[PDB]
Amino acid sequence: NVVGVHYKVGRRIGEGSFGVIFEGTNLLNNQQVAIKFEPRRSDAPQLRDEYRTYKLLAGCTGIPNVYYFGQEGLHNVLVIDLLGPSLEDLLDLCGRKFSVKTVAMAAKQMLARVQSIHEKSLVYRDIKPDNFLIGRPNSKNANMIYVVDFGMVKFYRDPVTKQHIPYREKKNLSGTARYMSINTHLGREQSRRDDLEALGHVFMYFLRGSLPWQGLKAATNKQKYERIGEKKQSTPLRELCAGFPEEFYKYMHYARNLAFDATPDYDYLQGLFSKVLERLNTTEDENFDWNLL
Amino acid sequence: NVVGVHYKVGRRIGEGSFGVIFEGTNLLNNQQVAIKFEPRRSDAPQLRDEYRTYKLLAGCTGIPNVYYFGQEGLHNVLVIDLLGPSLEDLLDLCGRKFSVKTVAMAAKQMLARVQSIHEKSLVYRDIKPDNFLIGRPNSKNANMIYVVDFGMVKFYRDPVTKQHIPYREKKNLSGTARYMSINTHLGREQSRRDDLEALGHVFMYFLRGSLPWQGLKAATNKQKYERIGEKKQSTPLRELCAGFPEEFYKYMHYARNLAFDATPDYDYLQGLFSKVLERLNTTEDENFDWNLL
Ligand SMILES: Nc1ncnc2c1ncn2[C@@H]1O[C@H](COP(=O)(O)OP(=O)(O)OP(=O)(O)O)[C@@H](O)[C@H]1O
Ligand SMILES: Nc1ncnc2c1ncn2[C@@H]1O[C@H](COP(=O)(O)OP(=O)(O)OP(=O)(O)O)[C@@H](O)[C@H]1O
Ligand SMILES: [Mg+2]
Ligand SMILES: [Mg+2]
DSSP, X not given: OEETTTEEEEEEEEEOXXXXXXXXXXXXXXXXXXXXXXXXXXXXXXXXHHHHHHHHTTTOTTOOOEEEEEXXXXXXXXXXXXXXXXXXXXXXXXTTOOOHHHHHHHXXXXXXXXXXXXXXXXXXXXXXXXXXXXXXXXXXXXXXXXXXXXXXXXXXXXTTTXXXXXXXXXXXXXXXXXXXXXXXXXXXXXXXXXXXXXXXXXXXXXXXXXXXXXXXXXXXXXXXXXXXXXXXXXXXXXXXXXXXXXXXXXXXHHHHHOOTTOOOOHHHHHHHHHHHHHXXXXXXXXXXXXXXX | OXXXXXXXXXXXXXXXXXXEEEEEEETTTTEEEEEEEEEOOTTSOXXXXXXXXXXXXXXXXXXXXXXXXXXXXXXXXXEEEOOOOBHHHHHHHTTTOOOHHHHHHHHHHHHHHHHHHHTTTEEOOOOOGGGEEEOOSSSTTTTOEEEOOOTTOEESBOTTTOOBOOOOOOOOOOSOTTTOOHHHHTTOOOOHHHHHHHHHHHHHHHHHSSOTTSSOOSOOHHHHHHHHHHHHHHSOHHHHTTTSOHHHHHHHHHHHHOOTXXXXXXXXXXXXXXXXXXXXXXXXXSOOGGGOO
């Protein structure tokens, strides 16, 4: 099947809320790509926006290159680089949990990606293990972690004047409840701190194998987000992070306490993870759990 | 990491009961392979047997080539061709069910693989969607279905004299309860008919999205296999296959009724599936659900 004049559609490799992702090849150079098909419907995310965002982030480390955007009948297509499995997929292959070393090494890369996005005056707003993918097996970047899916990004400040957006409330709950920040549950405008908090939730998820608020009770959607939000507030950080390196508690504590328009101290955060590795008497290498027997 | 003198171990791609499968490359020719690591322990399946079986089936269509078998410290390794995702994985990408066309086309290939194994005087005994994989994306055999994992094969007849094995009982339950034949639950020696029945269970699983005996009640292992076995016996075929082409009921009916040492009429079975395609006014092509938007 051929789309975008010179891209041959292969088999499905992923599925989302409204879109299907296929692996394919650019017929002019035989390069492998991923094609995201999005149905043009009222309740679907505008793929052109994701395209714009990819262009705006072109060149940043860990961000895939975008090649084509266009309409194919009743769908909008986005052609980007073909990447490997997500960290969620990798979990399934490693006993549903990652060791401290893997989490610290992964955290450093993930945190760097989020910083790149923030420096472009954007907040990601959809932090989840599913959106972080590693490179292709036989590639130089086989162990590099990338970020895909920019469907929910938003500008937290004017790019030119750096004037931060005002604090607002009544916001409608968007992304993944399991990882969202407490402020998000509370219907507050999301900023840099929220991305960092959600990232901390993912880190703890990796270490423990699960979060205290996963799979609750016979409730409805609005009840789900709420019961989860309440459980997050009632769960003490010392408890959430008990048994793991102190730096994890410190990360959670920092993220949770940042002010709405505060500029994160990314260097401090990166340092926490480097400390974790030091204590383990290990370095930041490529020995992730998924490359180990 | 290098094993078997010239095979470089990459990342994990699969996991089983005792073994871990990694993707890798043969350093002499840069060919991609899959390396199966098996811990040398009392309760683990002898990988040398799987090796022997691969050799015995060398050359058969849909059977991957074996390259190396050996010990690497506390593990036994088996190097075979690198294949694509399993049909179980593909299900996840297609809404947890396959259309009639995909099932009929898939059935023809799967049935051909089982026949090849039977013709070599062996019964597979581990029929499940997880053991049927398609080829690699950019390959001529991208849409060919293969069979891997020969850990439970057994000779049902002497290869030279073709003298069939006697009927025995008290057999201990082995493989996947969800797909096994009723005779298997009953602790009876498995033969060709059982492989065919389990294959029918998989076909119905594909079509319906689930089987009537999936996820039962708070029971134990021996209770699980039993409750499942009882549910299989209490579930009428007309009921199991209701709503789908008559040929599916006919396949189930044939498989269920074969005698212990009966030689299946593979041609008759293949014909049923061809009829299904004819009625759909379609042919056996490569338009599986996973290649379709
Ligand atoms: N570039 C890519 N290379 C390889 N796999 C990819 C690529 N892009 C996406 N995937 C896979 O496809 C899945 C879904 O992609 P994506 O998140 O863009 O779909 P979506 O409909 O926007 O998702 P959702 O709404 O579920 O977050 C990813 O989670 C991942 O498993
Ligand atoms: N040759 C291969 N190429 C690609 N993927 C493969 C290959 N062999 C196996 N796999 C993947 O790895 C998974 C497990 O493999 P395998 O079934 O051989 O392990 P096992 O320990 O014998 O399994 P189990 O006991 O779970 O059946 C497969 O189900 C499939 O997902
Ligand atoms: Mg996603
Ligand atoms: Mg298996």
